[PDB]
Design a protein around this ligand. Structure first.
Ligand SMILES: OC[C@H]1O[C@H](O[C@H]2[C@H](O)C[C@H](O)O[C@@H]2CO)[C@H](O)[C@@H](O)[C@@H]1O
Ligand SMILES: OC[C@H]1O[C@H](O[C@H]2[C@H](O)C[C@H](O)O[C@@H]2CO)[C@H](O)[C@@H](O)[C@@H]1O
Lengths: 498, 498, 498, 498
């Protein structure tokens, strides 16, 4: 029996804060140095472990191919290191929305946008023929279209330039995570719910496989199956803001239940898995032998989860239906590269969602985290929308330790880390910043911060294993681990006794 | 993330087997040495960790006060030690039923039965005036009636004679547990459901506080409360085989809900707690500084648990009702002496009980184990009735690890050990003995036996703390820890995934 | 291979400081509270782990038998606990010199001195017939002469009164060591070099076995050997300030080499061992089951060590000669009670001693510590004379870790602790107190203090085993472990590389 | 204090046996499969941990550049894996003597010998102009002379072909060490004592830097120092079998003490260090992220060690003189690649060497192992000549743990492993094989074999750091750690007590 009052370190969970969006201007400039280093000081005073910042592709390689400028980000990291915080870098091969709302506009290298200018098919395309310019379609990962280099080669060269230019921070251990962007918002998914094309929650979304490079692939595949006459979904699949039932593809016993539907969804989902597999290999080769975690982000698509079609998840590329786990195979893939899974949604509660949405964020989180730990990989996460209430802090606290704390040692289930939405004035406001420091404490299980990177203490990155299209075994349905009902360590409460 | 296939030792749970009832004759004789040492060899071949044997008081101190004969038990232990098994000794200050059914008859020292012969009040008495001769009423713990010695002093002298005569086995570490008998069948309870007086499941039972020594105590207490005119229950409490509702004491809003009823139940239950407290102190003083666990046994009284009166538990001395945990204070008491709680019922399932019984064995087990771990003590257990089916083996397996195994280290919840009903021919039968060896393996979490006493590896016994009638704080209701639905490691099944 | 800059905790060695001699007046008064709590604050500011204080027998039981007053010592400990320091209590059953030099005079309970007044034989006596009143001769351990109680019983009752009155400090873990006094200055030895009787370094000393109770014992023993006509040493043994060679008992091939000499020395040394054995048993029984170390102090008698007679050691009671280890059997005895050996001399260097003295403090320390670790017990120590130079700090540092630090884990050889001479103004003087804080740091192996009682972290006291006059096996000569030449972590130096 | 009889695992040291020289014929054939698998079975029955085998370059790439055949070695490893032994593979880029003595003849790829046929300068050359064909001179590491590939590129391609073809054995963890050959006999040294050119112990040897590629380098370097007129040693340096004093270069106050001599030796020794640095980088890049140790072998050149010139060491390339550690910088270099140092000589005793030789093998071993552990790297080793006596087994046992065993945890100093000379009939002979099994037991510190690769349990290979010609700091003289006098665990003896 444990000694009363003794809380083992294994229960500690790192907590990082995301820095303001344009902390480094679209122009490679780092302004307001003084101010920023005052917020960082407060953040550190709150017991935070570190921060997560976007290393924008459209800024570093702005001037031209292979010519990178790390000057600013260098000052930014030295500043952070000076305040005693660890660093989570996101390799952002995407655009940071430049919509009316003014929020800083950071596209991808402009010279790339000029190539797609005469070759739209480099972007993800819906069936109407709209082109999304925030990320490069996977249909061109292995295509030589960018001044000699292929999409994948551009990704490695970037991470490689980053590895060599940040070697000192990496040696010292200041950089703890390398979050590899695999699509829009840096997430391994299709751009199925583009706000720029008229999407509004809770539309089902749209399939994004109509660029020419992807189509050809679909044609070759449909022929080797003996059904050369099969086509991709059409008006039957509907549009961005449709409902599953107003559709013929997602209605109960609809087209997705068909041999042809299963063949399409299998193809579309595998295509996304393979895109992830290939990007993470380059990431593995670039960081092997270093003490740092590599992670891919998987978005949480909870709307329509309680509908037989799991429509929203399907358009995004996750083939998750009854009797078919569409997440587990991703996790086995990530397992291959000894990578961590970062799930970007876990503060939400089923009741905070309109009934009309068929949303089930909690049940989603359980399945995803369960299939991750079942394939022996570390799972990390963050919140989706900004929040400063105790309700949100408690939900996140539940998910970091589904079975509460373990007084006998490391818990049975535990997330390796959580990154908080974003640092801001509304947060640093005396009031909020108070509740916050409480949440950070509960995150550390009432322990004091430990700059020794306890737990997630970066382990040496191992060389990848070897794949096989044997992921299909991974889709076997399974019972998710049982979740506690409420948090063990609430921010404004006492020991519920479980 | 853990390494696949690596099962940490912390998940291991010791499994012992109870030896045949009269393995040592009522006459201090150890017959059939040859046969027995062949069963022990099989038992050890099954991976069992050890065995539990009754060190009968009525055999060792048979000839007369202070004159003990450990000869036979000495041969028995040397034999066991030779077969490489650990030893769980029960200090049996009780009688082993000498009913018609022939099963060996072992009373308590006959010279004691001759004293109670002219002084019946030494035995537990019901209101009709029946005397139970299997154990000495707690009303005489501190009474000088036995040739100079008091009940408690007789208990310590016994354990003390046992400590000195078994010092070598204790030094070597062969004796791992000292199970201290506190009543009938060696359990801290009142003899409320005596089969010798006509009791048949699921009778509510009867209060056992009518001996003269206890009565006086009740009179003194009722007067200092200002209600000198209060009495103990009468015909209103009913008889052994009554139902809660046919009673006026246990009916909804019955007498037990009254100020007088609460005052009686509080008194009756505290009296049992104090009897335990005093017997375990003597046990502490006798074994301090030695590497061995001391444990008290608490019986599982599941019938009528789902009735507002918790009748059966009340007559046995456990004041467990809505908004009042009658087990937690016992556990805090046991915590004081760094003692382990042995719960004698945990293979049963709610469905194996007649609906008419209002029985809830599973919900009982949860509450008892939960309140034990909440007071920071080790909880151990055993099955109540003999069983050889996979259904029973799986239930016990669930309770030893309510949240399954922990691949990251010691589980969150885990029992320190389990002792199996009893070694017998029907068990050692090729068939059964097979299922059994499977159960032992799952008990060890598919690991190989570890004679190093892993986990429960006997720690040094610490001197007791100091009580206060501050147990009353312990009766505050609480949420029990959440239990998994099915076992993690079933005997004839695969990984349910939780 | 270890990680550079990582110093494992196992290399940490606790450092305590002795408080001023009369910190509690001969009159049970604790004056200058304010001042003292200012020194304690400085001491704690120096990183010290705790302090060691004399719990004088002549103060606590001054008024009369069994009537103890812990009032003052209670204030003293609460003050110390308030400054965050651990406590090493010495059960001082001796007198604290009340010589001309004024230094506070604290005798043993005056009522005892009045008994010896008519019975001088209670004190250790030399052959001239001088009586030493600082401690009770072992010849009366088992003699009922003190108002009903025996010497040993008076010792246990004292430690028992101390255990019950200090239970809270003991529970909390503030009291870490119980140093049990076994003679003059609290050391298991004979008062062979009494400064009160004219002794001046480096006299050989005198045997102290002439009180009547001891003599009788010697007569009974000499008769069962068949030499009833043997006598104790006479003028042949010389006097306090003689040299080994001017003697006939200690000259090469002198009387100590004889069958009669060996028989006397064997008897005299065993008598001291048994006195220790019996006092430590009482100490064991009183503190079993508690988290605290019990230790006996053995004085370092280095003069005449390099002479074949080891004269000084012989008169003190240590039968240490060529081919006979007179310390190892003491250590095996101490092993029996799971006790620690505190050696009171280990800062000295062979060169700081006059050549005429035949002194070998370093070689002594090696033998004593080696035989201690060989019998599996913890060895602790302190300096003999007050010192504030780097030479002394480095010697002590060598002996705490004879083989320096271990970057792979706990060192091979390591002392469990060291108590510094005594807190004083000449030490707290800005200058000295500086060198001191350096020494404390090196003691902790350049780590920061750890109030968690790391290493010596008080383990539960185990019940004693059982002796036999089989100590004689322990006198077999043996090679001491090899010692490093210089310290690993000097106060004013760098890594000598070993 | 440790528990008696408990030997911590950290004291365990792996023991491997070298397989017979041509276990795989010069013709890629694996004959006598049956016999061999019977010896392996005995070897495993002796508790050995594994075996070390030469993966000859002249066999695998015999047919032609880039065309490797791993067929045989594949059968050999599967056989070994079947017998439950770990594998130490030597990347042998050298020749295995094909002298008169018949012992199997295995040269390097014959097509390479045909190139050097018209270009002798690819081989190491002495001043008379003799060419050694057992290894490629470092003067051609970065020269494109081998059908497009450079020496270094040929080495990586080989290790890379080995990594990919042995991936399964590597994944499983059967291959534990990758011993990278850096010269003759696979050792980082110059071929200074070639038996093929008339060398006989204890000749001083000859400098091996006269090939044209090396000379040019020496000319460029001597000019930038402003002494363009300096030359390499001549007749003044003598010949293979000369004595240090009959020379003018190695005589006291000879040419090696001169500014010109120091400049030559500095250049010659650095050249060897850099050759090692470059070969180990390729090895690092090829094995990063895998759980396997990479090691370089440094030969033990003990003759003339006790002479001021350290002649033999100087000709071999180790600039080790008074006030200059010529080994430490090698170790700091090896530290850069997280590599292990394998010292090939450590059973010898100073007394087994002719006085005329000025040999000091023991003092050599101390310095080399000490400088290795001081630069934070693991040191391993083997014996130089075959031996089956207890004298030899005890010496090796001393060096594996210079300070014996540590009952408190991992020793202060400990070798990571030892590979035994070679499996043979004279060893497997009932007699010898007996003493042997004793030695293996003492190697494991009287523990039973642990196939879990305890201790050296292959850790993940980390990416290399980055060099600088800042090795020069490493040549600062230092005190080696102190060595125990005799072994802790002798094969035919008892506890010397240190
Ligand atoms: O962006 C607003 C969108 O946020 C949430 O959905 C997130 C998802 O949980 C994870 C990933 O970061 O992207 C999705 C959207 O980009 C809300 O659930 C949703 O209602 C809201 O419209
Ligand atoms: O008391 C002065 C005495 O101290 C040292 O001898 C100590 C011994 O090392 C340990 C024990 O504390 O008692 C002995 C004396 O009581 C000096 O070595 C000695 O020279 C000095 O006279």
């Amino acid at each position: 029996a444990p000694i009363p009052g003794v809380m083992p370190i294994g229960n500690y969970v790192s907590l990082y804060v995301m820095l303001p969006l344009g902390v480094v201007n679209a122009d490679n400039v780092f302004p307001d140095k003084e101010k920023v280093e005052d917020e960082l000081k407060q953040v550190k005073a709150g017991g935070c472990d570190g921060v997560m910042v976007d290393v924008w592709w459209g800024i570093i390689e702005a001037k031209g191919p292979k010519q990178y400028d790390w000057s600013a980000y260098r000052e930014l990291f030295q500043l952070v290191k000076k305040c005693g915080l660890k660093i989570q870098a996101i390799m952002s091969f995407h655009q940071c929305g430049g919509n009316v709302g003014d929020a800083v506009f950071i596209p991808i290298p402009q010279w790339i946008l000029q190539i797609g200018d005469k070759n739209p098919d480099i972007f993800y395309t819906n069936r109407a023929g709209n082109r999304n310019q925030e990320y490069l379609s996977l249909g061109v990962d292995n295509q030589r279209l960018f001044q000699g280099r292929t999409a994948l080669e551009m990704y490695r060269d970037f991470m490689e330039s980053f590895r060599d230019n940040m070697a000192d921070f990496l040696k010292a251990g200041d950089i703890v995570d390398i979050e590899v962007g695999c699509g829009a918002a840096g997430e391994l998914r299709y751009p199925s719910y583009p706000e720029t094309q008229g999407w509004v929650f809770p539309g089902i979304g749209e399939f994004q496989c109509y660029d020419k490079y992807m189509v050809a692939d679909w044609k070759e595949a449909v022929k080797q199956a003996g059904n050369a006459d099969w086509e991709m979904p059409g008006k039957g699949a509907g549009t961005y803001n449709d409902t599953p039932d107003k559709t013929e593809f997602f209605r109960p016993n609809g087209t997705y239940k068909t041999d042809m539907g299963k063949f399409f969804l299998t193809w579309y989902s595998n295509k996304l898995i393979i895109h992830g597999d290939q990007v993470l290999e380059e990431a593995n080769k670039v960081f092997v032998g270093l003490r740092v975690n590599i992670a891919a982000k998987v978005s949480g698509i909870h709307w329509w989860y309680n509908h037989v079609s799991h429509a929203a998840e399907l358009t995004a590329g996750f083939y998750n239906v009854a009797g078919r786990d569409g997440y587990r195979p991703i996790a086995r893939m990530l397992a291959r590269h000894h990578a961590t899974l970062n799930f970007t949604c876990l503060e939400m509660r089923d009741s905070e969602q309109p009934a009309e949405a068929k949303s089930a964020p909690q049940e989603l989180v359980q399945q995803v985290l369960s299939s991750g730990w079942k394939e022996y990989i570390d799972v990390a996460g963050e919140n989706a929308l900004p929040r400063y209430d105790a309700t949100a802090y408690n939900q996140m606290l539940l998910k970091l330790r589904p079975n509460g704390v373990n007084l006998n040692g490391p818990p049975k289930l535990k997330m390796s880390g959580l990154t908080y939405l974003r640092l801001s004035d509304d947060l640093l406001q005396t009031d909020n910043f108070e509740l916050f420091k409480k949440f950070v404490k509960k995150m550390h299980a009432d322990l004091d911060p430990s700059p020794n990177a306890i737990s997630p203490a970066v382990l040496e990155r191992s060389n990848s294993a070897i794949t096989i299209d044997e992921l299909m075994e991974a889709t076997k349905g399974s019972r998710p681990f049982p979740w506690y009902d409420v948090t063990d360590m609430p921010v404004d409460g006492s020991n519920p006794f479980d």
